[PDB]
Each structure stands twice: as structure tokens, then as C-alpha cells.
Amino acid sequence: GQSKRVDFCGKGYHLMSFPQSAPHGVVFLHVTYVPAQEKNFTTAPAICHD
């Protein structure tokens, strides 16, 4: 599946995971999406038309 829980399946936004076995345990590989470059824009709650 795909989790929406914060930090449950790794940092960033979760996309998918893959298990790998290990002695006495399990290792998960968690694939996530992380925002990168960003820009500063002006904003507003609403646009007034007519």
C-alpha cells in the first residue's frame, strides 16, 4: 500500500516500500518524495473579479 502517516514509512512523502530479509529480522527500503528547489511568491486568499 501507500501510507499517509507522517514519518511512519520514512521521511518525506511516501511513495512505496520494498522489504529485504536479514538474520532475525526485516529491513525495509522506503521510497519517498522530497520537495527540493523552491521559490518565494506573493500570495492572496482570493481573487476579486466582478
Binding site: 502517516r5 507522517v6 514519518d7 511512519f8
Partner: protein
Amino acid sequence: PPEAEVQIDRLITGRLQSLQTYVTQQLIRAAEIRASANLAATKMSECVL
């Protein structure tokens, strides 16, 4: 010495049992606290972040 040693072993065994009992209870309580801490950490991530 001979007689004192007998009386002392009775006290040592008893004293040691008291310490073992203490430690066992601390291990059990620590486990309960750990569960609470894990829950608190989950809430921090899902409720605060």
C-alpha cells in the same frame, strides 16, 4: 568465623533477593514506559508534524 559465616550467608542471600526483586520490577516498569514513549513519539510525528 564459623558461626558468623552461617548467619551472614542468611543475610546475604536475603539482601541479594531483595535487589533482584527490585531490578525485575524496574525492568517491567521500564517496558511500560517505553511503550508510552513510543506512542508519544508517534503522536509527535502524526499530530504535531
